[PDB]
Symmetry: D3
């Protein structure tokens, strides 16, 4: 168990074998629950910015494995919020209480920074600004493997705010660990996929391309990964991109392949019309449900050495 | 068990037998706790408006039966609060996590709407604007039965904001399912009992009347059900009714019958003077305590098929 | 077990034997956990002002002993916050639900007041304005005993905001129960140790003195107890004292004794430079960690009669 | 010239001869302007609450007579607004600068209070909370005399917020100084004409009556004086009366007498439909225009001894 | 005198002869002031949105001609601001007081609307949202004629926010009334010159072109008219254009013609570096100073029939 | 006339002869008004922070001499307030309109800075943060000369906030220009008279001393100059000094000399009890009234060359 007590900060820190281990464990737990695997563990749920899916799915997963939970959903009633306490001190103190810390924070690098102050307590990154979202990627991969039967040789389009989308940074890096995947990036110029991601793809000799509409790749993709504009992260010089520039409607799916799935880490705003919800391609709610198995798997592996 | 996996949205959806089943189960649990009845259940506590009694009594009840709890007490740190997510999407995602959803929301019909998006997950309405409050009614009935020995042939006065009082809408409908109850409604004209409630009573041939003071019915009632003006729900054209128009003081109880109990779903503001708290008639804190047994009963029946 | 079902409001209400019992129990639990001691207990975590350490350490302690937790971290989404409910009514209702109430409130005397409305439910004071903080004192004593091997015949300096520091009021009273302790108080004139504390020391014939710098006592102390200026409690006529008047830096420790420990109930603001964190004297994070054992001990003793 | 250097605070302080003198002077100025009557006077325009008509008509009148103006339209940038200065000190200082003070203030009695601090400088009350509005009354009388040819033996209805309407308090008192006027008061019960006004009418043996609609007096009135609900002055227990309870529409004028005029001190909100503006009865804009002649007259008489 | 009592709302309503009359009058007044031309006039200065140049230059001009001024610089202390009065009623009442109304309002068409309610009182448009600014254009033309000796056969570049720039809408229309002018428009795509302006130029057979930098027209222009991004008028989908896209620096003027002048209606933000202020081309402060003569001229012509 | 077109920024820039010229002119105008001295002048009243006395007395003085006034009492509705315009640009533009600028601004050095952008237009400093208030000093000197018959060989106490009191900085410098004055400074340590003032007194060999109560100098002073704590200028580390530390009551005047006058530039807050107002020593309202003659004098001298 390479994941035992491992900090889970960036997909960059995980190997393909690490990913495969989590996915296999998640599949096993989906089939055979272990209500007491983490009995007598107490885990911190430390959310410094808003969340519905990530926090509630993480906490549910903790309880499904028998662990207890303490924490907060915003910093306003913490001593950090009201008394001037630093994040470093906050983590140091919490790490004397709990067996693991799940943390979401608006600043890039906050989770990595937390590991410097958490002593021997594993930190799991539930999102650090626009940087990384490794556990979203674990459930995304689980979902892709479940619907496509594999994680290699896929055609994957990512649409929307790729600049600020921590979801796509992690997912692109993860898929780049498998053979022969092909990427299509569709974003406003201002919210393009960051150069550092593209450079990584080039170093690996991975094929990718840019496009100005969903329509021009619709016939070719196995996975259409839609994203929300990260409104709360935008620089003022980017506010013209607040409205979704690419909106998916049911009619846009006319030439989609039979195996194609529309994914979306959620929440969605204007980028997916609700009429998509009724097509066989809509898979974002199934995807969200898979967060339970992916996160149970990760918690079990990080907190229980014996496989 | 007719309640197994049933959505609990409106008293209108429940039969008298349903009510009797919950009450009998609540009495049984009051006498013989079952700390593990709901072991391995995880329940969502989804509160979109303020609550003390309803949320904490519901969560306590969950723990008393061995269930775990995830959720929120306000929408501000959810993706609905900060990222523009719809309520429908919120429920859809939460329903992939938990075994039941307890939900309170400021908009009439929100709980019913949630059932359209919760898939196979039971929704329990902890209050939907000024509409329904079925679990308050369950504990009210439990309390009335406990102090009066029956739910039929009672004289019941309801006082205060009957227009916006979801408590009295549900309770009136429930009591209308039993034989021979007599209702006295005492409210400002602007906050009168809604016509749809009155029409229902007329269809059943149930006796009711309107009055302009507590004093004129005090000698006749078995139950005096006081309510708070629903200040946060009032239309501007109703702000003159913010102050309690009927205030109960200990001296007003001089001609009360020996069996008479003052109920109040709470919280109270100005409508009950604290000197009432010392009289044998004051029963609102006992009533609140009965929320534990009523809500345990409901949870047990909804989530465990075998009686 | 003298602590069984005892309200824990003020150090004034506890005897030296009471304190010794908690400390011995805490040491025992540190060595031999009891994951099921409080199984089937449900405890209220009722926080009406901000907290990181106190609330999370208390809740963790509850879970470590197998108890469940319900409550809130601020009053904003309670009926007290939104519907005008009194604190008295709030406590009365919560006390019908839970087996104990842990409460922090911004008003001096609030915890004592709560005991008047909690019926047969024990109230544990997690801080009542600038008055008392008994559980901070329990962990402080545990920490002092752990590093000094005793609680008598010590030289203890307290620095910073002693007027509003509920931490030092409780700790001074506790240490005054043991033989031969010597106190050094270092505070701005405006935030001096309250006269009522000093009078108590005089009645017991306890030696104490005032000083205008850390340096003048550094060579003599076993414990340097630093505090944060209670900014949110200051009268406007005291705002000049918001900035720490005594700042501890690593260089100030040049003549500290080898056994000397720097304590701080935390959070800290400007009063301890982070370079202190690396010296052998820094013990505030260890101190915070001891909150788990002290609070487990207190919960176990209050809620389980059999030792 | 009885008005020379007279404080103009309440209609109560003026005699019928005083009123007649202002009106005759206003008529004369309407016919023959005196651009230099007040040359070398400087007058303070001191407005502590909002105004369009009163302030701009007063200042225009000052300039039409050759006077200069200094002052403010709100207290926010005065030392009273930002530095904690009392109203008394404010008036004392301003009275060392100017030849007269025109003052509007939200508190009843403020203008009277100002006269205690203004030394030998005349104060003219442009409205003091819900109390008096003497200069509105002067222009109202001018307008009534202009359209009816007299101020005696009229039938005058006043409609709307009579409780808080400083306009109607002053106007009723003024009209009560002439022979044989008959009053009809039409107001919500909560905003009825104050008892002190009614008592005055009774002492003089003046006929008045209350009515619950405009329609029931429409055929009989010479003057229909409409008013705005004084929203910014209402007690919370009066907020149900924010919406106009009596709305005048053109169709309501079907049985109005040929000489009947609709007056309104303005601003109007919902109480007069704009279709009234086109009928021969609409006279509120003419009325507002007469503020120039009435206020010129008052200024000329107060500030220039020689008639 | 074609301008006598004329509403001055849009440049569209003025002829080339009208413009020439104002300019000739302005030149004459610049050379020979008439301190008493408008003695005994009172003019309203009615500003419903912010202004430095327009309001103060207009009021100064009024005083230079001997007129008096009443009004407001924001609507907050008017009855429109605090009592719910409509703009229409506001204008109707003010028009009974004054001899002319100068009005600036945030809504396009507000000045035109005012003329419907001002009776026989001339309205002068000091800016109506993003629509028209006729008096800015009068001073611009005066300034162009002063520096170029003519208003025909010029090369004029307009730069910045041409969509929301009421300044350039009026100025383009005015210059289109003279022979042979050539326009260069340099704007972000989102803030391009409105189609209705361009269509007008096409109808007249006027040469114009679009460009993406100042540099590409610098060598050819007689007038470089810079503008501020109208931040307070931008739609959210335009917020990316808040920062000036074209910034003029002294070094950019290296190939400017000797007669070239940089104009800017002001205020400027980031679009003109202060090092331009020292070059012979900088003429925006001279331009602002010419507002006095242009506005005196307009006031004199509108309010005094005899030339 | 050395003052003709002179910028009036700091008392430091004026000679004793300059001061004597203003005072003699003020006395002459007090005795013989000149209603047309400044006819055809237009002056800017540019107030960027709150004022009652300074702005209204300045504007009154302008009108008393026949000048007109344009300006603003706060920056909120200027283009500086709403459109991002710099102060420099604001002054540059205003200086093309008016014959002089009276300016008050919250930032030290703002008036001096304005002179760099005002071209040939004189700037008169009505207060620049905590720095200078030259026109307050002119009226103070006028008042001292009026009550003491001289400006030399006086005993003058200054009390309150001397650090932030622009009033006392200017007044101390002015009095230091005359022979043999003796100063007593009474202030909280935190708000002591600035060192740069004290150094100036030392360079001139002027006697001064510090005291901790009004009482210890009461018997010796000719002038008791009280001041308000400059609350809006205080650093947070000074907020303990918000309440007046020295409060003057009528009883404190028991041993005052018969010629002693209490001055206060006003507004006052808590530092002078209103019972002082009735004693012969109270002279602050007379002092404020003298602002008219001092400011008329200054305006006349600055704007009219011929004496």
């Amino acid at each position: 168990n390479p994941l035992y007590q491992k900090h889970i900060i960036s997909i960059n820190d995980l190997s393909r074998d690490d990913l495969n281990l989590v996915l296999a464990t998640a599949a096993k737990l989906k089939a055979n629950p272990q209500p007491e695997l983490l009995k007598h563990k107490v885990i911190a749920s430390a959310f410094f910015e808003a969340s519905t899916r990530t926090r509630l799915s993480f906490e549910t997963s903790m309880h499904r494995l028998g662990a207890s939970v303490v924490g907060f959903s915003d910093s306003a009633n913490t001593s950090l919020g009201k008394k001037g306490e630093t994040l470093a001190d906050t983590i140091s103190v919490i790490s004397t209480y709990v067996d693991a810390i799940v943390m979401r924070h608006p600043q890039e690098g906050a989770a990595r920074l937390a590991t410097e102050f958490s002593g021997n307590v594993p930190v799991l990154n539930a999102g650090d600004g626009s940087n990384q979202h490794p556990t979203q990627t674990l459930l995304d991969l689980f979902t892709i493997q479940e619907t496509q039967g594999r994680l290699d040789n896929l055609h994957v389009a990512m649409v929307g705010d790729l600049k600020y989308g921590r979801t796509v940074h992690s997912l692109t890096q993860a898929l780049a660990k498998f053979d022969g995947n092909r990427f299509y990036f569709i974003a406003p110029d201002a919210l393009a996929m960051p150069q550092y991601i593209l450079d990584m793809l080039d170093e690996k000799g991975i094929a990718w391309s840019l496009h100005s509409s969903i329509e021009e790749v619709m016939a070719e993709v196995d996975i259409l990964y839609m994203t929300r504009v990260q409104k709360e992260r935008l620089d003022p010089s980017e506010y013209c991109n607040v409205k979704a520039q690419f909106v998916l409607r049911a009619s846009d799916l006319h030439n989609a392949k039979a195996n194609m799935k529309v994914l979306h880490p959620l929440p969605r705003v204007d980028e997916i019309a609700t009429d998509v919800d009724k097509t066989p391609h809509a898979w974002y709610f199934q995807q969200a449900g898979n967060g339970i198995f992916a996160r149970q798997a990760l918690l079990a592996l990080v907190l229980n050495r014996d496989l």
